[PDB]
């Protein structure tokens, strides 16, 4: 399957509550700072902000069940949405496939470890 259906949607609810404190299904720079912080790095509010911009829609400072999986979403054939989002979410597929599934982001959850870059794939690094 190329598309999210039910099956995937019922499998990021749980990768999600792996994100999701409050299990409410929107979380915020807040809440997913707190999971990189328990990760390794330690992304400051205002520098997560930064990251929460991007998978906001509107800017309300909160990912919505539909965002969050439009991280993976993003991808398609013709190039009418920011893809360079997909390189940061890259880390996720370490198999390079250029698309990460619910699978993918709740084995990374866990898979994650100081073996971990975003250069995976991103030719020139962000951060020079
Ligand atoms: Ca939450
Ligand atoms: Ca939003
Ligand atoms: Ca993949």
Not at 70 to 98: C, I, P, T
């Given at each position: 399957?190329?598309?999210?259906?039910?099956?995937?949607?019922?499998?990021?609810?749980?990768?999600?509550?792996?994100?999701?404190?409050?299990?409410?299904?929107?979380?915020?720079?807040?809440?997913?700072?707190?999971?990189?912080?328990?990760?390794?790095?330690?992304?400051?509010?205002?520098?997560?902000?930064?990251?929460?911009?991007?998978?906001?829609?509107?800017?309300?400072?909160?990912?919505?069940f539909?965002?969050?999986?439009?991280?993976?979403?993003?991808?398609?054939?013709?190039?009418?949405?920011?893809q360079?989002?997909?390189?940061?979410?890259?880390?996720?597929?370490?198999?390079?496939d250029?698309?990460?599934?619910?699978?993918?982001?709740?084995?990374?959850?866990?898979?994650?470890?100081?073996?971990?870059?975003?250069?995976?794939?991103?030719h020139?690094?962000?951060?020079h």
């Amino acid at each position: 399957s190329s598309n999210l259906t039910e099956e995937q949607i019922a499998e990021f609810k749980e990768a999600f509550a792996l994100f999701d404190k409050d299990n409410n299904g929107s979380i915020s720079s807040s809440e997913l700072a707190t999971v990189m912080r328990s990760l390794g790095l330690s992304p400051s509010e205002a520098e997560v902000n930064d990251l929460m911009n991007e998978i906001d829609v509107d800017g309300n400072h909160q990912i919505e069940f539909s965002e969050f999986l439009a991280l993976m979403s993003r991808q398609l054939k013709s190039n009418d949405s920011e893809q360079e989002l997909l390189e940061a979410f890259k880390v996720f597929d370490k198999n390079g496939d250029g698309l990460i599934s619910a699978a993918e982001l709740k084995h990374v959850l866990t898979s994650i470890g100081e073996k971990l870059t975003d250069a995976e794939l991103e030719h020139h690094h962000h951060h020079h």
